[PDB]
Amino acid sequence: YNYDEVLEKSILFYEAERSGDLPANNRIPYRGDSALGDQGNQGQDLTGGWYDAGDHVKFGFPMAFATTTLAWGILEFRDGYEAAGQYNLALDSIRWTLNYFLKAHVSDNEFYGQVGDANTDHAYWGRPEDMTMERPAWSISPSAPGSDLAAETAAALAAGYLVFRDSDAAFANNLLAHSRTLYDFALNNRGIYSQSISNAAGFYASSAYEDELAWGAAWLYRATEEQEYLDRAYEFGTTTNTAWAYDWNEKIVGYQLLLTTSAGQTDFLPRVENFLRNWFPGGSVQYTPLGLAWLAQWGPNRYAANAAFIALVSAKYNILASESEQFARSQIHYMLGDAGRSYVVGFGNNPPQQPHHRSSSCPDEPAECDWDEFNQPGPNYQILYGALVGGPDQNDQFEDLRSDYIRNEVANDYNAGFQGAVAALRAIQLRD
Ligand SMILES: [Ca+2]
Ligand SMILES: [Mg+2]
Ligand code: NA
């Protein structure tokens, strides 16, 4: 597989998800300016960010987690991004959401965590450029806490500081200052963001915020080396529980691995190894007949690519390296085409033609786009290069239907671990 092309197209997927005022060098010809009215309740500019999935909601929790995970992969697998000619484009990719998080952090203890009503948004089928419905914006604050959302965004900002500090120190320093402030807000104003922003509860409900507090602390310790953050990581982290998955809701193995590798903390390594062995063949995750580690019907590709990412970070730091590399390669290669078809839109052999995705489902301007384009039985008019679809059922079956909102789903978080894993595999090619 051409990993250079996979990386190029994965970053193009994120570019096709951009909201707001698009740059002159926009590479997605069917996308234009959209949601230019996104704003806070006092008129604060909230334009930009990524649309979460095939919809036009800006869901701050997965948007931040996808950014943290992408930044981590850029830090660890820079050599693979560079070899692919995609390093500057990867930085541009996450600069987009990091700038959005800065806008959303309107004051020390207020942070906008959603733009768009998901009920209204999902009732619409059409271009983002054609939207006319109200797009409310909701924030977390001392009266409306969201320790999970705030600490995940702090994690993304601290990871961003580390990514950008050697090329754009003014940007990186601004990210770190806001990371510190947002993390203090998360620690001192405690609650579940999807209870305070209740519209999010039907879509990205957070089950617990303690793992985000440990994750944000671990990232701030990597960024600042200040003992108080390492203390916070032990305070809210677990050395006794093994993560079920790595994803936008569960940060456990993320901070365990981060503290083991970047911070040299040996107490967490047994739980990292437990996670890896649970996902490896012979573990606790069932594999489809054709070899996909299949955790659940909702975004199995996302869960497996996330585990592949964790495994490849582990291998880089010589944690079960041979087994981690073989497991990770097997999972990414399933998604690239090993079972007979690619699961990455616009890539490889017979890629998915009907991603559940509004803008790519619309024909070129000036043609009409509405629910006819949801229902139409053929391929999406635009190729959504790089999007990793949710994936097959537990028997490797995939119908490739736009109405299959489970298997044909695409989303920011689906590609986040995937993209870093591909960069890691590219880097291993340089090593060998
Ligand atoms: Ca959590
Ligand atoms: Mg076209
Ligand atoms: Na413009």
Can you say which residues are annotated as belonging to the binding site for Ca(2+)?
Answer: 208, 211-212, 249
CA distance 300 to 343: 11
Half-sphere exposure of 146 (CA within 13 A, CB side): 31
C-alpha of residue 100 to centroid of ligand 3, in Å: 16
Q: What angle, rounded to 10 degrees, do the helices at 3-16 and 412-431 form?
A: 160
CA distance 314 to 117: 39
C-alpha of residue 362 to centroid of ligand 1, in Å: 35
Can you say which residues are annotated as belonging to the binding site?
Answer: 208, 211-212, 249, 364, 382
CA distance 247 to 241: 16
What dihedral do alpha carbons 17, 48, 415, 257 form, nearest 10°? 180
- Count of domains in the chain? 1
Ligand nearest the Cα of residue 213 is 1
206: tokens are 């957070």
Can you say which residues are annotated as belonging to the binding site for Mg(2+)?
Answer: 364, 382
C-alpha of residue 411 to centroid of ligand 2, in Å: 21
Report whether 302 contacts 390 (CB < 8 A): yes
Taking CA atoms, 256 is separated from 19, 29, 199, 218, 291, in Å, by 33, 41, 31, 9, 27
C-alpha of residue 211 to centroid of ligand 1, in Å: 5
Dihedrals phi, psi of 144, to nearest 5 degrees: -140, 70
C-alpha of residue 20 to centroid of ligand 3, in Å: 9
Report whether 71 contacts 156 (CB < 8 A): yes
The separation between CA 16 and the C-alpha centre of its own chain, rounded to angstroms, equals 14
143: tokens are 């009266």
**Burial class of residue 45 (count of CB atoms within 10 Å of its CB; 0-12, 13-18, 19+):** middle
CA distance 328 to 317: 15
The question of whether 166 is a catalytic residue gets the answer: no
CA distance 134 to 113: 16
Ligand nearest the Cα of residue 210 is 1
Ligand nearest the Cα of residue 48 is 3
Dihedrals phi, psi of 369, to nearest 5 degrees: -135, 120
> Which protein residues have a CB closer than 5 Å to ligand 2 (ion)?
364, 382
Q: Which of 210, 393, 400, 404 is catalytic?
A: 400
Q: 10 Å Cβ neighbour count for 378?
A: 8
Rg (the chain; Cα; Å): 20
> Which protein residues have a CB closer than 5 Å to ligand 1 (ion)?
208, 211
Q: In what order do the strands lie in the sheet with 111-115?
A: 58-59, 111-115, 137-140
Query: Sign of the C-alpha dihedral, residues 4, 62, 383, 25?
Result: negative
Q: Which of 79, 409, 413, 432 is catalytic?
A: 409
C-alpha of residue 353 to centroid of ligand 2, in Å: 14
The question of whether 117 is a catalytic residue gets the answer: no
Q: 10 Å Cβ neighbour count for 172?
A: 21
Report whether 116 contacts 57 (CB < 8 A): yes
Residue 176 is part of which domain span? 3-431
Report whether 245 contacts 301 (CB < 8 A): no
Query: Sign of the C-alpha dihedral, residues 388, 392, 393, 395?
Result: negative
SS (H, E, C) the chain: CCHHHHHHHHHHHHHHCECECCCCCCCCCCCCCECCCCECCCCCECCCCECCCCCCCEEHHHHHHHHHHHHHHHHHCHHHHHHCCCHHHHHHHHHHHHHHHHHHCCECCEEEEEECCHHHHHHCCCCHHHCCCCCCEEEEECCECCHHHHHHHHHHHHHHHHHHCCCCHHHHHHHHHHHHHHHHHHHHCCCCHHHHCHHHHHCCCCCCCHHHHHHHHHHHHHHHCCHHHHHHHHHHCCCCCCCCCCCCCCCHHHHHHHHHHCCCCHHHHHHHHHHHHHHCCCCCCCECCCCCECCCCCCHHHHHHHHHHHHHHHHHCCCCHHHHHHHHHHHHHHHHHHCCCCCECCCCCCCCCCCECHHHHCCCCCCCCCHHHHHCCCCCCCCCCCCECCCCCCCCCCCCCCCCCCCCECCHHHHHHHHHHHHHHHHHHHHC
Ligand nearest the Cα of residue 29 is 2
Indicate which CATH number applies to the domain containing 77: 1.50.10.10
Q: Is the bond leading into 366 cis (omega within 30 degrees of zero)? A: yes
C-alpha of residue 263 to centroid of ligand 1, in Å: 21
Strand partners, 139: 112
C-alpha of residue 389 to centroid of ligand 1, in Å: 24
Report whether 196 contacts 140 (CB < 8 A): yes
* Residue 58 CB partners (closer than 8 Å, separation 6+): 19, 35, 38, 46, 49, 50, 51, 52, 100, 114, 115, 116
Ligand nearest the Cα of residue 381 is 2
C-alpha of residue 208 to centroid of ligand 1, in Å: 4
CA distance 7 to 418: 9
